């Protein structure tokens, strides 16, 4: 699996509506192209992917 280092999170927009009204972006340094699984560890926010 790819190795992710220096992960940083910045929120572009945020609207607390019924649908997915927020967008966030992650910047990182990796070593190879691959797939990673994303998760939110609080139920305040629900990822779409």
């Amino acid at each position: 699996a790819p190795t992710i280092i220096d992960l940083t999170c910045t929120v572009a927009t945020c609207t607390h509506s019924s649908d997915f009204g927020g967008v966030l972006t992650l910047t990182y340094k990796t070593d190879k192209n691959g797939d990673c699984s994303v998760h939110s560890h609080s139920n305040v926010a629900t990822l779409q992917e």
Partner: protein, 39 residues
């Protein structure tokens, strides 16, 4: 060329390996967008 068995190459001048599963999945992943040629 001659990358890991899991990953295929998508260039001649450049070195940029991609997983096989990315090949022909309806979205580009290489500058020379040959992941989506000859599906």
């Amino acid at each position: 060329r001659t990358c890991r068995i899991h990953e295929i190459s998508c260039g001649a001048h450049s070195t940029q390996c991609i997983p096989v599963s990315w090949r022909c999945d309806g979205e580009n992943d290489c500058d020379s967008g040959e992941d989506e040629e000859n599906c």
